[PDB]
Amino acid sequence: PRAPRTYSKTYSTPKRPYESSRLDAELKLAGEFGLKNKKEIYRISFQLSKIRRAARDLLTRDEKDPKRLFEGNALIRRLVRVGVLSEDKKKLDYVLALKVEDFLERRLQTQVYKLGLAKSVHHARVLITQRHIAVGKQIVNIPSFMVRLDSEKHIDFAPTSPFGGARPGRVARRNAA
């Protein structure tokens, strides 16, 4: 009777499970952008392989086939609108080539670091969670925002966060009492 609540998975999994070449490599990415799960990496490989064998499929169509452009130009719009594809690259032969790290450097937990304002890449992840920084009045506690380079302009802290103008905060207030 119920209508079926749709779901899906967000992470693939390496077939060879112990390729230490790719396993060190995986961790360098992990301990760089501040990730907890190697499946935060496996996750963002997944969409990439989707974008690719979405995109790779379009360059088979006869050049400028009706739908190849509609969702072609729909695709490259989506990725510059988050700023992973750079503005030179909006004719979609180069979207096949989005090496993974581009996606990670466009996180929230990442740019909150590259804007200064994160002493470490992990001071980032720790304050995002804790009622700290926002974009509008809209607090965000998801270190995987994928900020869209438009709203990257306003990433100052929140008004209720006692690091960007607030009341003292919970344990300060009786360190002083």
């Binding site: 009777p1 119920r2 209508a3 609540r5 452009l69 509609f70």
Partner: protein
């Protein structure tokens, strides 16, 4: 299976009613009436979903029981009444009137119309034959029988309906070059006015249509609804007059209205 089904699950509901899946389990099963079940729309969705006058279903019943609503003239208090294409819904409060007319996306659109226009009607005649005592009658897409029409009305033609009373006065004909309205398939919504009609004795005569953008298409004759003369209709078409904007056409103009 032991007689009449009287329930309608969701996702059995007609898509063009645009109900969200999770609001329960069921759509409102339209009642029996003028319009085919799958080819109609009930009052409770009109007053609740597309037009958002009422919040819940319980309210829609409260609304109708005050004789507020009229369709084609009459009080018509059936919460699930099968109101269909080309009906008129006068609304006593607000002095609003709506003719029921498709988009070119094929759904039922909200379309306010004049008080003058709110008192005539058309119908694709679906049958014509003699009857009791030999008085001929026409019957049309909407479920009414007009006794004593002219011998010149054959079948497949539209008819003006006074609907303060019964009779017809004018009857547009089905010939090469009359304004048509596709009322099925999903060329549903597109418009205009002939190319020609392939006979195909045995069934399923094919109707060729040329929209007023020099774009052809074909649909079956059962689903072509002549509505008059080139560019000269006999009712008020809705916005964009059904000329099947492309996906890129539609989103090029989608971003044409770009600056606030």
């Amino acid at each position: 299976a032991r007689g009449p089904k009287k329930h309608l699950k969701r996702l059995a509901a007609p898509h063009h009613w645009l109900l969200d899946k999770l609001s329960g389990c069921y759509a409102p099963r339209p009642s029996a009436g003028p319009h085919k079940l799958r080819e109609s729309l009930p009052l409770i969705v009109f007053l609740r979903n597309r037009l958002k006058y009422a919040l819940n279903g319980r309210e829609v019943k409260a609304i109708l029981m005050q004789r507020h609503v009229k369709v084609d003239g009459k009080v018509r208090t059936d919460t699930t009444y099968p109101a269909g294409f080309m009906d008129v819904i006068t609304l006593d409060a607000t002095n609003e009137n709506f003719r029921l007319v498709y988009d070119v996306k094929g759904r039922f659109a909200v379309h306010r119309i004049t008080d003058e226009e709110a008192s005539y009607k058309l119908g694709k005649v679906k049958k014509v034959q003699l009857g009791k005592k030999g008085v001929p009658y026409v019957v049309t897409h909407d479920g009414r029988t007009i006794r004593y029409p002219d011998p010149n009305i054959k079948v497949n033609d539209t008819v003006k309906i006074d609907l303060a009373s019964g009779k017809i006065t004018d009857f547009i004909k089905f010939d090469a070059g009359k304004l048509v309205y596709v009322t099925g398939g999903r060329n549903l919504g597109r418009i205009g006015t002939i190319v020609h009609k392939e006979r195909h004795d045995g069934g399923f005569d094919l109707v060729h249509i040329k929209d007023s953008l020099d774009n052809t298409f074909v649909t079956r004759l059962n689903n072509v609804f002549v509505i008059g003369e080139q560019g000269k209709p006999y009712i008020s078409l809705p916005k964009g007059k059904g000329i099947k904007l492309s996906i890129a056409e539609e989103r090029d103009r989608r971003r044409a209205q770009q600056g606030l």
